PDB file of C-alpha atoms and ligand atoms in Angstrom:
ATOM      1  CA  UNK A   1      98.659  44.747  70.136  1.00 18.53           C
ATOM      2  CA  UNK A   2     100.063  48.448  69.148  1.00 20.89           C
ATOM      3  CA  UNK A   3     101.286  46.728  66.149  1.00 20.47           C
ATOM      4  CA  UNK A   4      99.229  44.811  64.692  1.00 18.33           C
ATOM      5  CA  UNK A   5      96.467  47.796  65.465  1.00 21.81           C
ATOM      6  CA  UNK A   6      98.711  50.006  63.325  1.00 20.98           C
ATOM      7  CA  UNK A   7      99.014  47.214  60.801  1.00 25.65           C
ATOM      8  CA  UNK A   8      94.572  47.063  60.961  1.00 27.67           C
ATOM      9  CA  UNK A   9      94.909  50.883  60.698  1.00 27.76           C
ATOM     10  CA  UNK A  10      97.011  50.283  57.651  1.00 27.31           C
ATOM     11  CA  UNK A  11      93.638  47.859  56.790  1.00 29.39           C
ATOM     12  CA  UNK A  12      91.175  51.039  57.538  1.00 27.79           C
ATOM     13  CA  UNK A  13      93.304  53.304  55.213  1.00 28.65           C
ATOM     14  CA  UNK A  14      92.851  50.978  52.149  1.00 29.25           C
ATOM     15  CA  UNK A  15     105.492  54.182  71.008  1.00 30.34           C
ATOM     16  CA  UNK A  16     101.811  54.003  71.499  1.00 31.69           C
ATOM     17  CA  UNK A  17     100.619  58.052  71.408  1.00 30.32           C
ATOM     18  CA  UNK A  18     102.527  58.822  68.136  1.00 29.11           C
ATOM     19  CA  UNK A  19     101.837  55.134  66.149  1.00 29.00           C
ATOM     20  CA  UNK A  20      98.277  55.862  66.872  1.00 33.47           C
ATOM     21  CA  UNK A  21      98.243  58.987  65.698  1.00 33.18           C
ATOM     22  CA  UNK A  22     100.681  59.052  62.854  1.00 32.12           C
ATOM     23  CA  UNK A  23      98.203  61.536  61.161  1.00 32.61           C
ATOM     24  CA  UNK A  24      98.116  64.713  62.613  1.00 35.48           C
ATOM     25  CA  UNK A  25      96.006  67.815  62.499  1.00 39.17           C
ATOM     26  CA  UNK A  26      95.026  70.847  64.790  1.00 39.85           C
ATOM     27  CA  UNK A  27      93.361  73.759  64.750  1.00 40.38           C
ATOM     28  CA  UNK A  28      93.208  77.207  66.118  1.00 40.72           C
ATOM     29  CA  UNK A  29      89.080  78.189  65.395  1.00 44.25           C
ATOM     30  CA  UNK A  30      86.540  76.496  65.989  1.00 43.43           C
ATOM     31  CA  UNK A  31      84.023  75.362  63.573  1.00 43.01           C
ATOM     32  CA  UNK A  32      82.510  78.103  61.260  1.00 46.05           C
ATOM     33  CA  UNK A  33      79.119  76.983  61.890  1.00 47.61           C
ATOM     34  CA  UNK A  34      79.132  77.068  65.090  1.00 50.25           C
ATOM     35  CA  UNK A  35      77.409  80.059  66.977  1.00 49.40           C
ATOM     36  CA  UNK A  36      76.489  81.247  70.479  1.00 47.81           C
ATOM     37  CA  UNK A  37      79.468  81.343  72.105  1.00 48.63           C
ATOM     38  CA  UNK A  38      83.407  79.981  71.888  1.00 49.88           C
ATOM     39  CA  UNK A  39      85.275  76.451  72.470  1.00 52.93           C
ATOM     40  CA  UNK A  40      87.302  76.602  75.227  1.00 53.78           C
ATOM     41  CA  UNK A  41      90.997  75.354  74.907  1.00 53.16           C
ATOM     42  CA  UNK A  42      90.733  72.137  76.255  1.00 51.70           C
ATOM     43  CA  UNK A  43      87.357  71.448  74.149  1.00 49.32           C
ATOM     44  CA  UNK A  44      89.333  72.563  70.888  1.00 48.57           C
ATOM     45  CA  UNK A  45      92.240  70.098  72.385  1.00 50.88           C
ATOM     46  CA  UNK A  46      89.587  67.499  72.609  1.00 49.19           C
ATOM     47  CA  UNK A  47      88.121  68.250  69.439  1.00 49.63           C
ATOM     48  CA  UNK A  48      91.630  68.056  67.787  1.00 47.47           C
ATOM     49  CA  UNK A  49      91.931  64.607  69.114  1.00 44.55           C
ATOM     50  CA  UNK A  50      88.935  63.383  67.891  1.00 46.78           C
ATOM     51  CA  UNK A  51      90.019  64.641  64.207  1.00 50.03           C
ATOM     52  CA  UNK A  52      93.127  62.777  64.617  1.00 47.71           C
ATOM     53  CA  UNK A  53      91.270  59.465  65.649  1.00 47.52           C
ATOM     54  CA  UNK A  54      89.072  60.166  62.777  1.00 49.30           C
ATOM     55  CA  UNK A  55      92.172  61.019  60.460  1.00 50.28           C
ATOM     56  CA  UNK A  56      93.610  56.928  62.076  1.00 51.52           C
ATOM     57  CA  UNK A  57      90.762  55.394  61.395  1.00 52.01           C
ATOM     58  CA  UNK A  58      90.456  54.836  65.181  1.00 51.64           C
ATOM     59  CA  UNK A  59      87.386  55.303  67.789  1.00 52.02           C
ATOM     60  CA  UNK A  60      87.553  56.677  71.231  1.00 51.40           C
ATOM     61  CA  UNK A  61      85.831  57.710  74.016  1.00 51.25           C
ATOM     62  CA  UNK A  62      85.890  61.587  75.556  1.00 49.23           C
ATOM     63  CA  UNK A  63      86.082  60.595  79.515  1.00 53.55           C
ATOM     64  CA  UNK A  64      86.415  63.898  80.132  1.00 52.86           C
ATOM     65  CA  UNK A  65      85.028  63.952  84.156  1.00 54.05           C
ATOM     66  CA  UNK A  66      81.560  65.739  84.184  1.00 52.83           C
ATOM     67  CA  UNK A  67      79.878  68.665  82.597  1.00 51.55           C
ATOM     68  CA  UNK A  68      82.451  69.532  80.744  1.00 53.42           C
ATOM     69  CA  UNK A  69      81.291  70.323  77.217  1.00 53.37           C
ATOM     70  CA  UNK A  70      80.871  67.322  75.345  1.00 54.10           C
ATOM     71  CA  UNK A  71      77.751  67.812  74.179  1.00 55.93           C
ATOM     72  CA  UNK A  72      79.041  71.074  72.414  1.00 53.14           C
ATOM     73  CA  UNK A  73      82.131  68.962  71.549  1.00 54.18           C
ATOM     74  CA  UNK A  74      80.464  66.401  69.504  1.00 54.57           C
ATOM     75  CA  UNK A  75      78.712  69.127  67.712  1.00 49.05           C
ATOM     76  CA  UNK A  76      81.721  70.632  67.174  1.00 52.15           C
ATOM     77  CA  UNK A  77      82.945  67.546  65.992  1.00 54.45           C
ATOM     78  CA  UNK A  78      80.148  67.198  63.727  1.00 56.34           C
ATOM     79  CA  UNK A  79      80.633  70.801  62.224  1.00 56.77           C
ATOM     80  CA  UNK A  80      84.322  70.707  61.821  1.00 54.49           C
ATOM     81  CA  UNK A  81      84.336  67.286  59.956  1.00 56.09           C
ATOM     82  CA  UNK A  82      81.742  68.970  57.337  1.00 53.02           C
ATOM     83  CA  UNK A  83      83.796  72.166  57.112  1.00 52.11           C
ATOM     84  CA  UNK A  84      86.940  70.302  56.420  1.00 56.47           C
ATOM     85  CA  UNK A  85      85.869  66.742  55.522  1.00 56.79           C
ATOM     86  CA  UNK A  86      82.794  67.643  54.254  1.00 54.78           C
ATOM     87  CA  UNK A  87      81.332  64.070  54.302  1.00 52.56           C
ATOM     88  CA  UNK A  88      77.906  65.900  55.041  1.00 48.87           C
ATOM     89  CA  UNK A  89      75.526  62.976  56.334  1.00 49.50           C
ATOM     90  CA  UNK A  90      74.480  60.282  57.543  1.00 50.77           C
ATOM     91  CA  UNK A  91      75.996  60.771  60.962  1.00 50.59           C
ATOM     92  CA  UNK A  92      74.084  59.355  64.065  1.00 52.62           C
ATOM     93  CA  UNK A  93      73.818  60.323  67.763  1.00 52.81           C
ATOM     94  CA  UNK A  94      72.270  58.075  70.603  1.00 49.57           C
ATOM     95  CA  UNK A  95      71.314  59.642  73.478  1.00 46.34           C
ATOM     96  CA  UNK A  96      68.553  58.938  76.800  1.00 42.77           C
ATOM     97  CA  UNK A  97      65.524  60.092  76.036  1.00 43.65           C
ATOM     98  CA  UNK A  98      65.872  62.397  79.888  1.00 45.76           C
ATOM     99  CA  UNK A  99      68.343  64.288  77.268  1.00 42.53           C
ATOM    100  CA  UNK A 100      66.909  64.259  73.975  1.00 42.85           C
ATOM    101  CA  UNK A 101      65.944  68.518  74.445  1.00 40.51           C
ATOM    102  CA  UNK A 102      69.046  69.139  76.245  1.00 45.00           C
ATOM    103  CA  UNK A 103      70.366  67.994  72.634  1.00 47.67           C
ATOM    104  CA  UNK A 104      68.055  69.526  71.004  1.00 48.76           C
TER     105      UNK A 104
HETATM  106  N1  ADP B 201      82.549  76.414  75.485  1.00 48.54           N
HETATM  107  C1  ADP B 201      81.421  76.608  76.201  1.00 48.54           C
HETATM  108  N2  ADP B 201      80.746  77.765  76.106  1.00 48.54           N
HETATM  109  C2  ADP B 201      79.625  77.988  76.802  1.00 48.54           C
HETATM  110  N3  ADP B 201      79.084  77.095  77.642  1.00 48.54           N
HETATM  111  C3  ADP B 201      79.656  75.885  77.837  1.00 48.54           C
HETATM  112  C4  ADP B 201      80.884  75.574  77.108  1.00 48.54           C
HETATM  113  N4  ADP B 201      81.241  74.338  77.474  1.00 48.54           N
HETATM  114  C5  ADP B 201      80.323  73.891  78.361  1.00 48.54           C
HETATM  115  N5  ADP B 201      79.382  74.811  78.576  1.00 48.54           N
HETATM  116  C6  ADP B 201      78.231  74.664  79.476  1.00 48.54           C
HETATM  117  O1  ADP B 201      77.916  73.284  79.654  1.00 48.54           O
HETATM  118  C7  ADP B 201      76.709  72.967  78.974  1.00 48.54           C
HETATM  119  C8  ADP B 201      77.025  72.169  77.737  1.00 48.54           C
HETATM  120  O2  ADP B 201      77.560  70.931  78.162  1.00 48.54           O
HETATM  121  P1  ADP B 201      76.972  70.210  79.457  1.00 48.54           P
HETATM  122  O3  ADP B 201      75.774  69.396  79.044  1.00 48.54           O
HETATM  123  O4  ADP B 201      76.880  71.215  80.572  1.00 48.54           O
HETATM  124  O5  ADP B 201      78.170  69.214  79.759  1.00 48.54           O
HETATM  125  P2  ADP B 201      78.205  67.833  78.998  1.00 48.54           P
HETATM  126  O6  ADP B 201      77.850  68.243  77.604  1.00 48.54           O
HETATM  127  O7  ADP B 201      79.654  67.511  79.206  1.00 48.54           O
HETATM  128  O8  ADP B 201      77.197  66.982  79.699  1.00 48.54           O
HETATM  129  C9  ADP B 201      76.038  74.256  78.593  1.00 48.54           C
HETATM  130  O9  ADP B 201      74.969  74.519  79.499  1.00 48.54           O
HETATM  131  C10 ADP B 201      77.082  75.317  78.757  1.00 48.54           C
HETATM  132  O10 ADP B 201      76.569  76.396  79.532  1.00 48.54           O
HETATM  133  F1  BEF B 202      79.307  64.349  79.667  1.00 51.42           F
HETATM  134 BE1  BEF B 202      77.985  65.342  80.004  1.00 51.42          BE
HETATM  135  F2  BEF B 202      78.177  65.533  81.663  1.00 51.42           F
HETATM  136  F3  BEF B 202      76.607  64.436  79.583  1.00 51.42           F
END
């Protein structure tokens, strides 16, 4: 599976851990844009994983328990991909209507 993944990941950029993320990147700040308040370690750790899936060509999903941020994460994730990617737009977010304003 692991192989012929890499080998479709190959296809998207035309062990398991380290073959999935043969591109690396991390970073020590947080997002420029982002105001009113800080990342905490684990959120940064979380967003640096999510720039490496992005940097694979691979999707994921932040089971983090409950609570934990990832609202704030995605943002982050959002902000740090159009301070360093800059591919500003169109990028989509589907939420339950109960949390539309919380997302606001
Ligand atoms: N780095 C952070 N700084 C400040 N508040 C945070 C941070 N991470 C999480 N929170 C708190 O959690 C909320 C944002 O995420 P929340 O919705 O609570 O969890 P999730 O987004 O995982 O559902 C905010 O109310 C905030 O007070
Ligand atoms: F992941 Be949060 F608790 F919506």
């Amino acid at each position: 599976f692991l192989d012929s993944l890499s080998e479709a990941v190959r296809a998207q950029q035309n062990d398991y851990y380290e073959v999935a993320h043969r591109i690396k990147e991390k970073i020590d700040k947080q997002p420029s844009i982002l105001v009113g308040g800080t990342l905490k370690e684990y959120q940064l750790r979380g967003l640096e994983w999510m720039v490496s899936l992005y940097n694979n060509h691979l999707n994921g999903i932040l089971a983090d328990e409950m609570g934990l941020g990832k609202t704030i994460q995605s943002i982050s994730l959002i902000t740090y991909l159009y301070e360093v990617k800059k591919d500003i737009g169109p990028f989509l977010v589907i939420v339950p209507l109960s949390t539309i304003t919380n997302w606001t």
